[PDB]
Design an enzyme around this catalytic site. Structure first.
Site, PDB file in Angstrom:
ATOM      1  N   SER A   1      21.560 181.152  71.333  1.00  0.00           N
ATOM      2  CA  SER A   1      21.153 179.349  72.034  1.00  0.00           C
ATOM      3  C   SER A   1      20.043 178.596  71.150  1.00  0.00           C
ATOM      4  O   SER A   1      20.317 178.841  69.811  1.00  0.00           O
ATOM      5  CB  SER A   1      21.506 179.747  73.065  1.00  0.00           C
ATOM      6  OG  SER A   1      20.689 177.882  73.257  1.00  0.00           O
TER       7      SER A   1
ATOM      8  N   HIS B   1      25.644 179.168  68.741  1.00  0.00           N
ATOM      9  CA  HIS B   1      26.669 178.982  70.337  1.00  0.00           C
ATOM     10  C   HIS B   1      26.638 177.654  70.248  1.00  0.00           C
ATOM     11  O   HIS B   1      25.543 176.901  70.033  1.00  0.00           O
ATOM     12  CB  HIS B   1      25.691 179.811  71.230  1.00  0.00           C
ATOM     13  CG  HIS B   1      26.032 179.494  72.476  1.00  0.00           C
ATOM     14  ND1 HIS B   1      27.425 180.225  73.375  1.00  0.00           N
ATOM     15  CD2 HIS B   1      25.498 179.317  73.480  1.00  0.00           C
ATOM     16  CE1 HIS B   1      27.575 179.819  74.092  1.00  0.00           C
ATOM     17  NE2 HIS B   1      26.097 178.885  74.231  1.00  0.00           N
TER      18      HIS B   1
HETATM   19  C1  LIG Z   1      22.831 176.215  71.199  1.00  0.00           C
HETATM   20  C2  LIG Z   1      21.637 175.211  71.684  1.00  0.00           C
HETATM   21  C3  LIG Z   1      21.640 174.124  71.622  1.00  0.00           C
HETATM   22  C4  LIG Z   1      21.295 175.354  73.549  1.00  0.00           C
HETATM   23  C5  LIG Z   1      22.562 176.028  73.871  1.00  0.00           C
HETATM   24  N1  LIG Z   1      22.793 174.944  75.169  1.00  0.00           N
HETATM   25  C6  LIG Z   1      22.680 173.946  75.446  1.00  0.00           C
HETATM   26  O1  LIG Z   1      22.167 172.762  74.429  1.00  0.00           O
HETATM   27  C7  LIG Z   1      21.777 173.519  76.556  1.00  0.00           C
HETATM   28  C8  LIG Z   1      21.976 174.253  77.466  1.00  0.00           C
HETATM   29  C9  LIG Z   1      20.959 174.371  79.272  1.00  0.00           C
HETATM   30  C10 LIG Z   1      20.660 174.584  79.340  1.00  0.00           C
HETATM   31  C11 LIG Z   1      19.669 174.497  81.216  1.00  0.00           C
HETATM   32  C12 LIG Z   1      21.161 173.483  81.785  1.00  0.00           C
HETATM   33  C13 LIG Z   1      22.142 173.274  81.478  1.00  0.00           C
HETATM   34  C14 LIG Z   1      22.627 173.636  79.994  1.00  0.00           C
HETATM   35  N2  LIG Z   1      22.206 172.460  77.000  1.00  0.00           N
HETATM   36  C15 LIG Z   1      21.291 171.725  77.477  1.00  0.00           C
HETATM   37  O2  LIG Z   1      19.826 171.854  77.722  1.00  0.00           O
HETATM   38  C16 LIG Z   1      21.354 170.717  77.924  1.00  0.00           C
HETATM   39  C17 LIG Z   1      20.786 169.101  78.908  1.00  0.00           C
HETATM   40  N3  LIG Z   1      21.291 168.156  79.591  1.00  0.00           N
HETATM   41  C18 LIG Z   1      23.134 168.228  79.106  1.00  0.00           C
HETATM   42  C19 LIG Z   1      23.540 168.593  78.212  1.00  0.00           C
HETATM   43  N4  LIG Z   1      23.050 170.010  77.858  1.00  0.00           N
HETATM   44  B1  LIG Z   1      22.447 177.468  74.525  1.00  0.00           B
HETATM   45  O3  LIG Z   1      21.354 176.857  75.756  1.00  0.00           O
HETATM   46  O4  LIG Z   1      23.548 178.160  74.626  1.00  0.00           O
END
Ligand SMILES: CC(C)C[C@H](NC(=O)[C@H](Cc1ccccc1)NC(=O)c1cnccn1)B(O)O
Ligand SMILES: Nc1ncnc2c1ncn2[C@@H]1O[C@H](COP(=O)(O)OP(=O)(O)OP(=O)(O)O)[C@@H](O)[C@H]1O
Ligand SMILES: CC(C)C[C@H](NC(=O)[C@H](Cc1ccccc1)NC(=O)c1cnccn1)B(O)O
Ligand SMILES: CC(C)C[C@H](NC(=O)[C@H](Cc1ccccc1)NC(=O)c1cnccn1)B(O)O
Ligand SMILES: CC(C)C[C@H](NC(=O)[C@H](Cc1ccccc1)NC(=O)c1cnccn1)B(O)O
Ligand SMILES: [Mg+2]
EC number: 3.4.21.92
Lengths: 181, 24, 297, 181, 181, 181
Positions: free
Chosen positions: A81, A106
């Site tokens: 991620s 991801h």
């Molecule tokens: C690939 C990179 C962009 C990160 C990936 N996903 C995200 O972008 C993360 C995944 C996540 C982690 C904790 C809580 C909620 C969501 N997205 C966020 O942090 C996030 C935060 N606020 C709104 C929408 N998404 B990873 O965590 O799978």
């Protein structure tokens, strides 16, 4: 001194834990100290992280892009991620990875359901869409891919072996073992 | 350790020349 | 005395005559040139010294060179500069070199190595080179020097530091800690507040934080340093001529913002006047011949 | 010394965690110490916070407006809810943000239901209304908007990219990367 | 030293957390030390507390009324319930509050149900009534109100803005910002 | 100093706990410090671990294969799952085990169910298959088995006594007791 204090004397920061705000503020504090101690000596950033977090990603994405020192990223066992974006975020020519490290690129997700009215969910989805495009625009300027290729590739989990993470452009060298050991 | 030695130079103990009283 | 017609025009030309040696540093010159205009217009404060300056700034941009350009302006040579090298004073007890030994100690008869330099020449530019590298109470002995304008000798003679121009060149690598737009002077000003005791900072007339030497000033600095080796060190019936591509090559090699004009000076003794010293000893080009310097690559 | 102790020597406080009373009393204690150490040197305030809290917001809003030092706010990855108000609360000409930092301006909410009689709920709602007007009056004197524009804009979540947070007036400069890194 | 140790050297105590017995015994220990270090120099008491507790209130009410030093209270973001009584409990002429601090005066409550026979509940209610009268008698000698006015005003939650908390008599000065900041 | 600090002065690291990311980043920090203190002196690695973790396995697998020092693994009571791979990952001629230590080689598993669409589960299963082949390819280059033999042997749990773990090739010497004790 710990080992972690000893690696930081040699300008090495561990990502190690998942990228949350507590870990991002640690790494940003470490990147700015190592910039101030010697701004012309390469900060190394060891990445064994399961990812997580986008604002915490882009907090330590922007800081390792901000600082005067070149960043050498090294994927230890895992860059999943967000941490795979940080792995590609090293300086070109840097960005090592150990031979059995997996790199999991991801698309951004929401951990659990966030409720709300549809006019509030059109905004949380326009945000997770621009988090997706920013994940792909960032990962395209560091891998040299075309950012629609990354949208096709990160559409599902794409676990890259280190040998096929340099073919993808995430890393540059799968770094060899020093002594047979 | 950083205790200073204080040279403490004396005033010059020196000789004296003489005017003499003339006699026959 | 009321000024000669020549000396009036020279003293209004004082910026542009000190710029014959100081390249750039414009507010540094017109802060120390105004202090001499105050003394010569009859507006010198008769209690305070004529000028009291902290020439703070980056190492090599002309802190000592302006104190020498000032001393050449007022005297004709920079050997009339009273330069007290403050790196020699590392502990509290070398303050007995400023005003000499007290009664009953050796070196009482010689009565100071700063006070006796000014009893002879009360009109003097007194340079305190690397004042940051003194002890924290070396410069506390100069807290009556910079308001009352006098320093009591160890023998018991208040000496007039009133007609002196005191200069304290403090020495204050790339970017500092944290996020900041652009890339400074307030970092240098407040480091003086933490290092120097703000009794001493209130007595300084002007604190001048110096500029980075820009690339347009390094090109002008090449012409100045080539003018050192020619004419003073090539009085061998040899003439040194540099093409305009050659001075551009020296400026591109000698230009680093964070040091300034010493990497240019090390470049000239690495490109020009060590290759030239091999050509004089070999007599490839020798005494009685004009040297031109074409650009190498 | 930690990195966090090292940034505080260079007059930098992290917001970092969410703005609750524990974090607000930390930042107020840090802002008043840095005012006393040098009141004429700019305190920098790094903001990676998910927001939260209004009285804890206005505790460290008022303190960074109180102190003799100018406050330089820098949004790291996120300034949401209360932290976007603190981001705008820096001195004009200050208020940086990193290029991929999101700024989430947002009207005040109640975390969970607070029960009570209707005469007690008319007061908790007259308070969340004056918390809303105070959020908009504060954010109008720091962005130069007209405080009904902010009521229309913060009616839902308005996530601002840093480039469109200086167009909104939250920040002043999207601060550039120092070396390519 | 922490910032909290540094503010205490300048004779400033934070209330900060809610007023329970753990926080009250801390503040009483801090008020008596600062009385012993210099009894003729004003203790400052910073209040960002959500209130709570009556015996813990009257523990640190009585101590800040006991000590030889005058107490300067400063409401930071919030003085709710018990903490608003402590805010008024400063010395007259003291008792500042920051301009966006809310002051929530409020009649005493029971957190949750306490069971018992009716003869045991007639005593727990005669106690919460004399806790109410003691809250109003204390808040009348420090605001100059008539103690039936406070019973009418604290009948519900009365959230006072700092500008209308000095009109009420809780504070004396809404303290101005030092530099624009 | 602890005993653990005393063993590390003699270049001995404990695995001890299960191999998770917290333990892997500890051991990688310890292996790189001991490489920097003396790269030509053998790091000893004591293994009493119940295993767990594959990316954390291959983080400290690759590091003990990276470093200039030869690694001497010693199985204390247990090397299960990932820790048996780390036990075989020592230098040949090294890799001791105490006589009553069990070695549990075992194919990779998923701790609990991971949900998802079938196109997402075809990737989590292509990953646990390449985690299985990488477990068997790693364990074949260190035991000298044919990597299909290990697939047949690690098809279930294969608990090896230390005397039959050197017959398998996991260890080299079942190390004898020094004094009868
Ligand atoms: C690939 C990179 C962009 C990160 C990936 N996903 C995200 O972008 C993360 C995944 C996540 C982690 C904790 C809580 C909620 C969501 N997205 C966020 O942090 C996030 C935060 N606020 C709104 C929408 N998404 B990873 O965590 O799978
Ligand atoms: N402004 C300048 N004009 C002309 N030459 C300059 C100037 N600045 C530097 N140089 C060149 O480099 C040398 C260094 O200048 P100077 O002796 O003033 O150093 P400085 O600024 O006092 O540095 P430090 O911090 O090391 O004391 C000069 O002697 C000259 O050769
Ligand atoms: C935008 C600024 C004003 C802050 C935003 N919301 C608020 O104002 C916060 C949101 C919040 C946080 C924690 C617990 C309950 C409510 N409001 C309050 O703190 C609050 C407190 N008491 C009554 C009413 N609102 B943020 O938290 O979304
Ligand atoms: C001015 C203050 C005292 C008014 C409110 N506080 C109280 O009344 C507090 C809240 C509380 C705490 C614990 C248990 C029960 C109740 N009251 C008491 O401390 C209390 C304690 N014993 C009996 C009755 N009330 B406020 O903090 O909501
Ligand atoms: C034998 C070696 C390879 C390790 C063994 N199994 C694994 O490979 C471990 C078992 C495990 C441990 C914790 C959580 C989930 C799964 N595999 C993994 O860590 C793992 C991680 N991500 C995807 C799939 N498997 B051990 O844990 O039995
Ligand atoms: Mg110098």
């Amino acid at each position: 001194s710990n080992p972690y204090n000893k690696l930081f004397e040699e300008r090495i920061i561990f990502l190690g834990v998942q990228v949350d705000d507590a870990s991002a503020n640690d790494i940003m504090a470490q990147l700015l100290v190592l910039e101030s101690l010697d701004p012309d000596r390469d900060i190394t950033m060891y990445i064994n992280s399961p990812g997580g977090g986008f604002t915490s990603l882009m907090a330590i994405y922007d800081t390792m892009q901000y600082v005067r020192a070149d960043i050498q990223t090294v994927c230890l066992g895992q860059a999943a991620s967000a941490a795979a974006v940080l792995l590609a975020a090293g300086t070109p020519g840097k960005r090592m990875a150990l031979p059995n490290a997996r790199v999991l690129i991801h698309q951004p997700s929401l951990s659990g359901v966030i409720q709300g009215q549809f006019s509030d969910l059109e905004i949380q989805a326009a945000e997770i869409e621009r988090m997706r495009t920013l994940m792909e625009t960032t990962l395209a300027r560091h891998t040299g891919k075309d950012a629609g290729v990354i949208r096709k590739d990160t559409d599902r989990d794409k676990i890259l072996t280190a040998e096929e993470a340099k073919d993808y452009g995430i890393i540059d060298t799968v770094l060899e073992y020093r002594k047979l050991s | 350790m950083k205790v200073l030695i204080l040279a403490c130079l004396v005033a010059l103990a020196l000789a004296r020349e003489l005017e003499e009283l003339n006699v026959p | 005395f009321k000024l000669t017609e020549a000396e009036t025009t020279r003293l209004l030309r004082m910026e542009e005559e000190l710029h014959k040696r100081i390249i750039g540093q414009e507010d540094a010159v017109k802060a120390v040139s105004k202090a001499i205009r105050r003394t010569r217009a009859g507006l010198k404060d008769p209690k305070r010294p004529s000028g009291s300056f902290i020439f703070a700034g980056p190492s090599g941009v002309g802190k000592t060179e302006l104190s020498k350009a000032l001393a050449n302006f007022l005297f004709g040579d920079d050997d009339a500069l009273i330069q007290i090298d403050m790196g020699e004073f590392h502990d509290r007890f070398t303050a007995s070199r400023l005003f000499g030994a007290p009664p009953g100690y050796v070196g009482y008869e010689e009565g100071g190595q700063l006070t006796e330099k000014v009893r002879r020449k009360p009109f003097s530019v007194v340079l305190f080179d690397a004042i940051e590298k003194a002890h924290q109470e070396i410069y506390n002995s100069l807290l009556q020097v910079l308001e009352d304008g006098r320093l009591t000798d160890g023998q018991g003679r208040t000496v007039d530091f009133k007609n002196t121009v005191l200069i304290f060149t403090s020495n204050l690598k790339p970017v500092g800690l944290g996020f900041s737009k652009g890339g400074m002077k307030q970092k240098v000003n407040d480091e003086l507040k933490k290092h120097f005791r703000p009794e001493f900072l209130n007595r300084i007339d002007d604190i001048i934080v110096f500029h980075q030497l820009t690339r347009e000033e390094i090109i002008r600095m090449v012409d100045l340093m080539i003018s050192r080796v020619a004419g003073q060190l090539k009085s061998k019936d040899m003439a040194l001529v540099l093409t305009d591509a050659a001075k551009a090559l020296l400026a591109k090699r000698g230009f680093d913002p964070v040091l300034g004009a010493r990497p240019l000076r090390r470049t000239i003794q690495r490109e020009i006047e060590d290759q030239l010293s091999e050509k004089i000893l070999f007599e490839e080009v020798g005494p009685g011949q004009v040297v031109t310097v074409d650009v190498d690559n």
